[PDB]
Write an enzyme that holds these catalytic residues in place. Structure first.
Site, mmCIF file in Angstrom:
data_model
loop_
_atom_site.group_PDB
_atom_site.id
_atom_site.type_symbol
_atom_site.label_atom_id
_atom_site.label_comp_id
_atom_site.label_asym_id
_atom_site.label_seq_id
_atom_site.Cartn_x
_atom_site.Cartn_y
_atom_site.Cartn_z
ATOM 1 N N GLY A 92 3.791 -7.254 6.038
ATOM 2 C CA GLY A 92 2.899 -7.825 5.054
ATOM 3 C C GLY A 92 3.547 -8.025 3.703
ATOM 4 O O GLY A 92 4.653 -8.563 3.606
ATOM 5 N N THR A 93 2.857 -7.590 2.648
ATOM 6 C CA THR A 93 3.396 -7.701 1.300
ATOM 7 C C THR A 93 4.548 -6.736 1.053
ATOM 8 O O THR A 93 5.330 -6.953 0.122
ATOM 9 C CB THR A 93 2.283 -7.481 0.274
ATOM 10 O OG1 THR A 93 2.781 -7.727 -1.047
ATOM 11 C CG2 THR A 93 1.727 -6.074 0.362
ATOM 12 N N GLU B 3 -3.998 -6.490 -1.597
ATOM 13 C CA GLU B 3 -5.411 -6.136 -1.597
ATOM 14 C C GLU B 3 -5.764 -5.380 -2.872
ATOM 15 O O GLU B 3 -4.917 -4.670 -3.430
ATOM 16 C CB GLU B 3 -5.780 -5.290 -0.372
ATOM 17 C CG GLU B 3 -5.212 -3.877 -0.338
ATOM 18 C CD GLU B 3 -4.003 -3.741 0.569
ATOM 19 O OE1 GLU B 3 -3.156 -4.657 0.573
ATOM 20 O OE2 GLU B 3 -3.896 -2.716 1.274
ATOM 21 N N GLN C 14 0.827 -1.202 0.000
ATOM 22 C CA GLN C 14 0.000 0.000 0.000
ATOM 23 C C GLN C 14 0.862 1.254 0.000
ATOM 24 O O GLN C 14 0.549 2.233 -0.691
ATOM 25 C CB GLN C 14 -0.941 -0.007 1.203
ATOM 26 C CG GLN C 14 -1.846 1.206 1.288
ATOM 27 C CD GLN C 14 -2.879 1.081 2.382
ATOM 28 O OE1 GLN C 14 -3.843 1.843 2.431
ATOM 29 N NE2 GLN C 14 -2.679 0.123 3.274
ATOM 30 N N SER D 193 7.683 -1.006 2.338
ATOM 31 C CA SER D 193 7.536 -0.603 3.727
ATOM 32 C C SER D 193 7.971 -1.739 4.638
ATOM 33 O O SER D 193 7.661 -2.905 4.381
ATOM 34 C CB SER D 193 6.089 -0.214 4.040
ATOM 35 O OG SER D 193 5.856 -0.233 5.434
ATOM 36 N N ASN E 205 4.452 11.512 0.810
ATOM 37 C CA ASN E 205 4.873 10.996 -0.480
ATOM 38 C C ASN E 205 5.287 12.093 -1.454
ATOM 39 O O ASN E 205 6.042 11.800 -2.382
ATOM 40 C CB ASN E 205 3.764 10.133 -1.067
ATOM 41 C CG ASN E 205 3.382 8.994 -0.155
ATOM 42 O OD1 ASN E 205 3.882 8.891 0.963
ATOM 43 N ND2 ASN E 205 2.478 8.146 -0.613
ATOM 44 N N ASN F 33 8.271 8.013 9.090
ATOM 45 C CA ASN F 33 7.070 8.833 8.966
ATOM 46 C C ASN F 33 6.982 9.876 10.070
ATOM 47 O O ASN F 33 6.468 10.974 9.839
ATOM 48 C CB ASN F 33 5.822 7.951 8.980
ATOM 49 C CG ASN F 33 5.934 6.770 8.045
ATOM 50 O OD1 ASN F 33 5.952 6.927 6.825
ATOM 51 N ND2 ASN F 33 6.005 5.574 8.613
ATOM 52 N N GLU G 231 27.203 5.420 -9.634
ATOM 53 C CA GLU G 231 28.285 6.209 -9.051
ATOM 54 C C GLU G 231 28.109 6.354 -7.547
ATOM 55 O O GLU G 231 29.045 6.111 -6.772
ATOM 56 C CB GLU G 231 28.334 7.591 -9.692
ATOM 57 C CG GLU G 231 28.493 7.637 -11.189
ATOM 58 C CD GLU G 231 29.915 7.469 -11.652
ATOM 59 O OE1 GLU G 231 30.829 7.615 -10.821
ATOM 60 O OE2 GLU G 231 30.119 7.228 -12.861
HETATM 61 N N1 LIG Z 1 5.410 7.239 4.263
HETATM 62 C C1 LIG Z 1 4.399 6.435 3.949
HETATM 63 N N2 LIG Z 1 4.193 5.273 4.663
HETATM 64 C C2 LIG Z 1 3.164 4.450 4.348
HETATM 65 C C3 LIG Z 1 2.314 4.764 3.301
HETATM 66 N N3 LIG Z 1 1.384 3.790 3.215
HETATM 67 C C4 LIG Z 1 1.636 2.860 4.164
HETATM 68 N N4 LIG Z 1 2.731 3.263 4.881
HETATM 69 C C5 LIG Z 1 3.361 2.545 6.001
HETATM 70 O O1 LIG Z 1 3.259 1.147 5.803
HETATM 71 C C6 LIG Z 1 3.056 0.494 7.037
HETATM 72 C C7 LIG Z 1 2.234 -0.778 6.860
HETATM 73 O O2 LIG Z 1 2.399 -1.303 5.561
HETATM 74 P P1 LIG Z 1 1.271 -1.018 4.455
HETATM 75 O O3 LIG Z 1 1.875 -0.401 3.218
HETATM 76 O O4 LIG Z 1 0.218 -0.114 5.044
HETATM 77 O O5 LIG Z 1 0.616 -2.449 4.125
HETATM 78 P P2 LIG Z 1 1.276 -3.430 3.037
HETATM 79 O O6 LIG Z 1 2.743 -3.134 2.852
HETATM 80 O O7 LIG Z 1 0.524 -3.310 1.737
HETATM 81 O O8 LIG Z 1 1.067 -4.899 3.653
HETATM 82 P P3 LIG Z 1 -0.364 -5.309 4.260
HETATM 83 O O9 LIG Z 1 -0.507 -4.723 5.642
HETATM 84 O O10 LIG Z 1 -0.478 -6.812 4.333
HETATM 85 O O11 LIG Z 1 -1.438 -4.749 3.360
HETATM 86 C C8 LIG Z 1 2.348 1.505 7.915
HETATM 87 O O12 LIG Z 1 2.858 1.458 9.226
HETATM 88 C C9 LIG Z 1 2.642 2.855 7.300
HETATM 89 O O13 LIG Z 1 3.479 3.604 8.147
HETATM 90 C C10 LIG Z 1 2.513 5.932 2.581
HETATM 91 O O14 LIG Z 1 1.756 6.221 1.658
HETATM 92 N N5 LIG Z 1 3.558 6.767 2.908
HETATM 93 N N1 LIG Z 2 38.456 20.679 -14.884
HETATM 94 C C1 LIG Z 2 37.363 19.881 -14.903
HETATM 95 N N2 LIG Z 2 37.173 19.013 -13.876
HETATM 96 C C2 LIG Z 2 36.093 18.197 -13.842
HETATM 97 C C3 LIG Z 2 35.129 18.263 -14.949
HETATM 98 N N3 LIG Z 2 34.170 17.361 -14.678
HETATM 99 C C4 LIG Z 2 34.495 16.763 -13.505
HETATM 100 N N4 LIG Z 2 35.636 17.267 -13.003
HETATM 101 C C5 LIG Z 2 36.290 16.831 -11.748
HETATM 102 O O1 LIG Z 2 36.565 15.436 -11.866
HETATM 103 C C6 LIG Z 2 36.020 14.695 -10.780
HETATM 104 C C7 LIG Z 2 35.048 13.675 -11.351
HETATM 105 O O2 LIG Z 2 35.620 13.039 -12.490
HETATM 106 P P1 LIG Z 2 34.646 12.381 -13.585
HETATM 107 O O3 LIG Z 2 34.353 13.368 -14.687
HETATM 108 O O4 LIG Z 2 33.367 11.921 -12.935
HETATM 109 O O5 LIG Z 2 35.486 11.136 -14.155
HETATM 110 P P2 LIG Z 2 34.776 10.033 -15.084
HETATM 111 O O6 LIG Z 2 33.584 9.445 -14.370
HETATM 112 O O7 LIG Z 2 35.759 8.934 -15.390
HETATM 113 O O8 LIG Z 2 34.326 10.674 -16.370
HETATM 114 C C8 LIG Z 2 35.292 15.671 -9.875
HETATM 115 O O9 LIG Z 2 35.934 15.721 -8.599
HETATM 116 C C9 LIG Z 2 35.377 17.023 -10.551
HETATM 117 O O10 LIG Z 2 35.944 17.981 -9.654
HETATM 118 C C10 LIG Z 2 35.406 19.230 -16.034
HETATM 119 O O11 LIG Z 2 34.625 19.349 -17.000
HETATM 120 N N5 LIG Z 2 36.508 19.984 -15.937
HETATM 121 MG MG LIG Z 3 -1.883 -3.421 1.764
#
Ligand SMILES: Nc1nc2c(ncn2[C@@H]2O[C@H](COP(=O)(O)OP(=O)(O)OP(=O)(O)O)[C@@H](O)[C@H]2O)c(=O)[nH]1
Ligand SMILES: Nc1nc2c(ncn2[C@@H]2O[C@H](COP(=O)(O)OP(=O)(O)O)[C@@H](O)[C@H]2O)c(=O)[nH]1
Ligand SMILES: [Mg+2]
Ligand SMILES: Nc1nc2c(ncn2[C@@H]2O[C@H](COP(=O)(O)OP(=O)(O)O)[C@@H](O)[C@H]2O)c(=O)[nH]1
EC number: 3.6.5.-
Lengths: 437, 101, 50, 431, 101, 431
Positions: free
Chosen positions: A144-145, A71, A11, A140, A228, A206, A254
């Protein structure tokens, strides 16, 4: 090109999927019917949707989500709502009987039937791709599920798909807030069984979102829709670099290897800033230093765990918007000056940065307001040990005299698996302490 | 303001390249030739003999019409030339009368 | 003197030429086959999706 | 004044030959109806090699189209440049016999081979000095690989003096598209060895590799592949049709390229085959033409030239150039890549330049390589055939139409004999 | 130059047929969108810009793997606006770093 | 007609290559379409150094662009000056190295190295001199470092007598911007040490400090920094393209810098770098041009030469300019303070003078300083590596694809050996 299939289960999965796919559709300009008006005579060659939406040749952007639940209520609410013709109705899988907050029922009896159906659906959405970056499971730990069927899904996906990164958004149980009572049993079991099958496991509390919405968003009475909205902004700021043009663009693999020190410790914390509302964002500039200090503010995390009672093992910050890299390094250095931010003893290069160009998208009705720059910070700390001990105390205090165990025995799991999961999380606690000292 | 190499390989020279092709041959072509050989065909290219050994060489040649170091005929030329025919005839007669005898 | 030889840097060097070869590719990882999933029964007694 | 006939056999051979006539008709400037409308007089200076005069100023190709299924043949007739053939060389069949070497050579095709030989004789002594024949077919079917090779054998016993060309599409491990391809290919190579003067083995896998990774086509289909094969055919037999600085006759290439009488299986190639986007980024010169000739990516067979030894190598250039630089580039490739060349044949490249370029780009050059890496294709076809033969799969059709395991295993023996002949002259001690 | 003009003639000859078929289908009230997607200006399979300087060709950039897969397009308007909001028409880097003369 | 094949590796590599080709297209007067619109014939006399020849007046770069992520190739293609690049030189993958030297070197990335060496061979034997190759890579990334080191190893194995300079964006001392960057920097320097010929270590924090303190600019973005790095490239390879009173090529600069083979890590530097408003307060002559180039603020690397000793110093001056003053100031800095100068090299300054200034300047200079003060950057990288390695942090990622801790120990052995070598040649006395 760089696709990501979303695996909304439970849910929580369905509701987070609704409030996240509305953000995705309005960010890419895709209307609820599926078509893009998007002044197609001018330009229109942007393949920025080819991570979440698939073409048909007709302009229909079918998404890449599998809304699975036991459900029928929430899935049929999706099939009745405004995003009805957007989703393929073979992608919204539903069952008949709920798991009734039983890991045993959702993993051994009910989950064993429709897992093949949803895995064939995953197969079709996976070979309707040109190279898959990674699945994203929004589940969650409540029970349950969301804990047993997600378990079976990962245990099958690890065998079926290669390495094939398996990102997790998890609704962790709050320290004191709970809508259920078998939450510790379900959380112990699902953590033990998804320990060796998960790659990153972002938990969100929550209670912490409630505090953030009541303090920063100025909402006197928040709810799961706003919660949400925050989760949707987090996931958009995470996988925006896969979609949009950036300067230091940071794709999906990364920030796994730049954030996860050891394969057992894959439990980061996600913090978004600015979460300020319109009437107060009227009043100050949301500059890079201010939003970086907002992310490192300890009463802005989304799991109720104190980061000052812990060591930052790694920190990956994804800036998004009008962001300049000398300001990035100035803000990071001003953060590193402070001694109350204690990075871990063996990681001096504790930061991995990414910068994306497009500012984050606002929604017409959400209470997060339209900013021109924002930060999503994902950090591995040792400060999750207090949360794990908090839930460990509840599990031991409920398992001392065997409360709610005959149900798990009846729908299938044996008595010893509780002890295996118990010693597994005790080992994880010792691992956190060892990598902390 | 021109330059030597700049003018040398960006010439302001307008030659006369024919390409006198029917606008039906030009349409049956460039439809086979949509991906392979997508270019204007070189119908102007002649053979090596045809393009190297031209009449313009003889037209632009400025050789003196009498070469000033050539030997002449003379008054006994024809008689001296037909004397060789005498040598052939009046030795062949003797040789073949010897063959008969 | 024999300047007919020793001409790597003397006159204009025509390009010495190699051979080409094909490329294999990334050799993408395994996708888990169309046969691997046995869909649940629809026709008969109690079903789970229908 | 030397002429070669064309004989198309099978669906593949008929489509390839239709595109071949359709791309040389506008190379010589011919109407779809048949009348001359070209630019230069050199297009009509040598026209009797492929064509015959008719009443009025129109020309008829010297081609015989042979196939057992009327659908391919009348599709060829109804296609573009289809109203140019004489409607008396079209010899249809009765059934759709197909993918069956017995239903080719032995049955059905033996009832049509008399009429085909009659129409070929009519087209053959209708000229003053016949040079040879070229036949187009594929070694996957039962019409191209069957009674087509029957025609090859009959022509060999009829005119045992003339140059023979077979532009054969040979099977591939990938793009296989047929289950009896090893049977048909192994039965056809036996007749292709001792009855032809030169064969051109062409792979659909390499053709798709060129058409997808070099020409960058969204829809490659088969017209583009037949365009490639036809351009190779024109580059081969261009020295008969156009004057050149030095020319390469078909018998001249046959003398220069097959060293020993059963090693005439050449893989072809062509340059420059370039994409529309990247055509403006490379200039057109002999040095890079040598790259795009000798590249394994632009080889029209799936052989890897590094996995063998070049016995002899062609370079039939076609355009305006300097063949000081052509000859020294053909020297330079041997000077560097000396490992992949036989050391007991010095300067094993035969080159020619035929002045008048192909229509389009300024330069081109076609390639004919008698590499020892074609034994990969033969070894793989032979091992697939002997994998299917011991369990006798798909053999009841051949035994019903009349063969036996004796003929099948003697075809296998001759096939591995050819593999052994190429392995003998592959990398070893020359002295 | 004649090859470039031939590419221009190819585009302006394809687009009239494409416009005729698109107008006929719009009169017949079809979806039109696949036809309008196929009838894009350019001369290749790439998803990139038209590249009007090089004769108007959207080149085909391909990945080296089993199945080709073209290089996509990601440059939007808002991303370019925030990319050039500080730098301002990227040739201005030279003028910003001194380099006036 | 000496020339360089340019290579872009990684995201940083592709951006740096894009800005470098932009600045030298502006230097040679070439629009993004690729046509010459300049006025001086000296801008076009030596253009084969970096540009090849295409159909028409086109001028394509002799560059190869390598990446494992499609977004950077997308940016380079669809940005300005993307029309000039060849589509076939855009060689790239899809999966991504993901900041892993292992995943850029041993696994995928060694799957692209055959294609990249094919293109490097292509434009390397499509040459007549080939002064050498260039790699503008970054240390701290996956395909920036691992792919780059693999390419350097293969290219040095094939062509071992040719200049192989690299431009090596090194990790910053303060603010890491990458977590596994000490691992990548150590394990990449371990290959550069015995692979490359010369290396220009450039640091992003130092470039930020230049673009902030000196050029004001407040928001320095990346285009400004990249234009500094590209201007350093032009100041290096300007005497090879343009005539000078006293010119110096890449081989000459390498010979006059390295005294021993494992000492090829230098200090970039450019002059003058003054703001808009400060351009009309300072005279632009040889004294200011050399003192702003020898200023330790202006040091493009991240290590103060005040604590350390110069091995050798290259000053590439540019402009129609007197050189008695140049020689006198090169003498005068040494005579003012020879304490920051090795006494076992008497006159440790190489000097070049080029006639044509960079596009947009009257007279400029470029600094290449081989110093023993760069050892603290290497010591810093070594101490970060061993701090993150004694607890085996982030090691499973590298060891999962086929290496082990033995290679890391060898890399640290080589790294500490080079640190001790720099210390030895710093503290060594004349007698
Ligand atoms: N943050 C957040 N928590 C949720 C939400 N919906 C349910 N929960 C949490 O999920 C917990 C229970 O699980 P549920 O999602 O309600 O139920 P389920 O996972 O479908 O499993 P069943 O109980 O068998 O239906 C509750 O304690 C809620 O805190 C949501 O929309 N947002
Ligand atoms: N001078 C310069 N440095 C860069 C640039 N892009 C990323 N960096 C630096 O390089 C590091 C990341 O490297 P990255 O580009 O992700 O390497 P790659 O994943 O192998 O392509 C970071 O700490 C940045 O500070 C660029 O366009 N110019
Ligand atoms: Mg449910
Ligand atoms: N290059 C090319 N190959 C073709 C074409 N049509 C069929 N083929 C090949 O020919 C094989 C089938 O042989 P077929 O034409 O049925 O032989 P037939 O029995 O003589 O007609 C297939 O494996 C195809 O790969 C074509 O138009 N071009």
């Amino acid at each position: 090109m760089r696709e990501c299939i979303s695996i909304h289960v439970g849910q929580a999965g369905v509701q987070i999927g609704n409030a996240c796919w509305e953000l995705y559709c309005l960010e890419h300009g895709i209307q609820p019917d599926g078509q893009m008006p998007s002044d197609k005579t001018i330009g229109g060659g942007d393949d920025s949707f080819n991570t979440f939406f698939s073409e048909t040749g007709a302009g229909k952007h079918v998404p890449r989500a599998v809304f699975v639940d036991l459900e029928p209520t929430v899935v049929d609410e999706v099939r009745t709502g405004t995003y009805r013709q957007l989703f393929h109705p073979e992608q919204l899988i539903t069952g008949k009987e709920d798991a009734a907050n039983n890991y045993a029922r959702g993993h051994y009896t009910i989950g064993k039937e429709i897992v093949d159906l949803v895995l064939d659906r995953i197969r079709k959405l996976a070979d309707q791709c040109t190279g898959l970056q990674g699945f994203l499971i929004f589940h969650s730990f409540g029970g349950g599920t969301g804990s047993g069927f997600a378990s079976l899904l990962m245990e099958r996906l690890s065998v079926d798909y290669g390495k094939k990164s398996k990102l997790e958004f998890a609704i962790y149980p709050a320290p004191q807030i709970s809508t259920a009572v078998v939450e510790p049993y379900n959380t112990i079991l699902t953590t033990h069984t998804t320990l060796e099958h998960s790659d990153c496991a972002f938990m969100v509390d929550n209670e912490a979102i409630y505090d953030i919405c009541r303090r920063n968003l100025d909402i006197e009475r928040p709810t799961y829709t706003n919660l949400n909205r925050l989760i949707a902004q987090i996931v958009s700021s995470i996988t925006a670099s896969l979609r949009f043009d950036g300067a230091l663009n940071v794709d999906l693999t990364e920030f796994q290897t730049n954030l996860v020190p050891y394969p057992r410790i894959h439990f980061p914390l996600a913090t978004y800033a600015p979460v300020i509302s319109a009437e107060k964002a009227y009043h100050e500039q949301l500059s890079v230093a201010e939003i970086t200090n907002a992310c490192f503010e300890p009463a802005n995390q989304m799991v109720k765990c104190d980061p000052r009672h812990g060591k930052y093992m790694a920190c990956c910050m994804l800036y998004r918007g009008d962001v300049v890299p000398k300001d990035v390094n100035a803000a990071i250095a001003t953060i590193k000056t402070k001694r109350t931010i204690q990075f871990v003893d063996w990681c001096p290069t504790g930061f991995k940065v990414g910068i994306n160009y497009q500012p984050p998208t606002v929604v017409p009705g959400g209470d997060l307001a339209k900013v021109q720059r924002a930060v999503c910070m994902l950090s591995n700390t040792t400060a999750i040990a207090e949360a794990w001990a908090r839930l460990d105390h509840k599990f031991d205090l409920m398992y001392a005299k065997r409360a709610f165990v005959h149900w798990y025995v009846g729908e299938g799991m044996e008595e010893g698996e509780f002890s295996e999961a118990r010693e597994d999380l005790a080992a994880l606690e010792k691992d956190y302490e060892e990598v902390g000292v | 303001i021109p330059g030597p190499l700049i003018t040398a390989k960006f010439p302001p020279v307008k030659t006369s390249i024919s390409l006198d092709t029917d606008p039906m041959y030009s349409a049956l072509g460039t439809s086979l030739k949509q991906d392979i050989f997508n270019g204007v065909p070189h119908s102007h290219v002649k053979s090596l003999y045809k393009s190297s050994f031209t009449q313009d060489i003889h037209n632009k040649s400025v050789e003196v019409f009498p070469p000033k170091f050539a030997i002449q005929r003379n008054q006994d030329s024809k008689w001296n030339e037909d004397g060789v025919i005498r040598m052939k005839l009046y030795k062949a007669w003797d040789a073949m009368t010897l063959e008969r005898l | 003197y024999s300047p007919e030889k020793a001409g790597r840097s003397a006159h204009l060097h025509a390009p010495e030429h190699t051979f080409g070869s094909r490329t294999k590719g990334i050799t993408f990882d395994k996708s888990p086959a169309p046969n691997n999933y046995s869909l649940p029964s629809i026709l008969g007694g109690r079903s789970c999706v229908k | 004044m030397r002429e070669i006939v064309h004989m198309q056999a099978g669906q593949c051979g008929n489509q390839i030959g239709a595109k071949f006539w359709e791309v040389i008709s506008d190379e010589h400037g011919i109407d779809p109806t048949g009348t001359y409308h070209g630019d230069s007089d050199l297009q009509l200076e040598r026209i009797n090699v492929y064509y015959n005069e008719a009443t009025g100023g129109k020309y008829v190709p010297r081609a015989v189209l042979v196939d057992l299924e009327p659908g391919t043949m009348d599709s060829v007739r109804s296609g573009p440049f289809g109203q140019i053939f004489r409607p008396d060389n079209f010899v249809f069949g009765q059934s759709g016999a197909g993918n069956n070497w017995a239903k080719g050579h032995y049955t059905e095709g033996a009832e049509l081979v008399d009429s085909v030989l009659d129409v070929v004789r009519k087209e053959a002594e209708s000229c003053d000095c016949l040079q040879g024949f070229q036949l187009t077919h594929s070694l996957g079917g039962g019409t191209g690989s069957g009674m087509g090779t029957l025609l090859i054998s009959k022509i060999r016993e009829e005119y045992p003096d003339r140059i023979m060309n077979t532009f054969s599409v040979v099977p591939s491990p990938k793009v296989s598209d047929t289950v009896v391809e090893p049977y048909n290919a192994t039965l056809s190579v036996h007749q292709l060895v001792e009855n032809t003067d030169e064969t051109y083995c062409i792979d659909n896998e390499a053709l798709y590799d060129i058409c997808f990774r070099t020409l960058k086509l969204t829809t490659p289909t088969y017209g583009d592949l037949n365009h490639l094969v036809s351009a190779t055919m024109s580059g081969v037999t261009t020295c008969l049709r156009f004057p050149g600085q030095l020319n390469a006759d078909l018998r001249k290439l046959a003398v220069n390229m097959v060293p020993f009488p059963r090693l005439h299986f050449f893989m072809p190639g062509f340059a420059p085959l370039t994409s529309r986007g990247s055509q403006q980024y490379r200039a057109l010169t002999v040095p890079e033409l040598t790259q795009q000739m000798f590249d394994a990516k632009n080889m029209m067979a799936a052989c890897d030239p590094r996995h063998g030894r070049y016995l002899t190598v062609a370079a039939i250039f076609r355009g305006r150039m300097s063949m000081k630089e052509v000859d020294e580039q053909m020297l330079n490739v041997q000077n560097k890549n000396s490992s992949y060349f036989v050391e007991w044949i010095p300067n094993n490249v035969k080159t020619a330049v035929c002045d008048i370029p192909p229509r389009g780009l300024k330069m081109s050059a076609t390639f004919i390589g008698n590499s020892t890496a074609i034994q990969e294709l033969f070894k793989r076809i032979s091992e697939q055939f002997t994998a299917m033969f011991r369990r006798k799969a798909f053999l009841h059709w051949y035994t019903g139409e009349g063969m036996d395991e004796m003929e099948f295993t003697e075809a296998e023996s001759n096939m591995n004999d050819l593999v052994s002949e190429y392995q003998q002259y592959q990398d070893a001690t020359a002295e | 130059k004649k090859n470039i003009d031939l590419l221009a003639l190819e585009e302006q000859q394809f687009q009239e047929y494409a416009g005729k078929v698109i107008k006929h289908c719009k009169e017949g009230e079809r979806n039109v969108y696949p036809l309008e997607k196929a009838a894009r200006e350019g001369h290749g399979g790439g998803h990139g810009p038209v590249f009007d300087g090089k004769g108007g060709i959207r080149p085909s950039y391909l990945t080296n793997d089993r199945v080709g897969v073209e290089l996509p397009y990601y440059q939007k308007g808002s991303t370019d606006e925030v990319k050039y909001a500080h730098i301002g028409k990227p040739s201005n880097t030279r003028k910003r770093l001194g380099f006036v003369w």
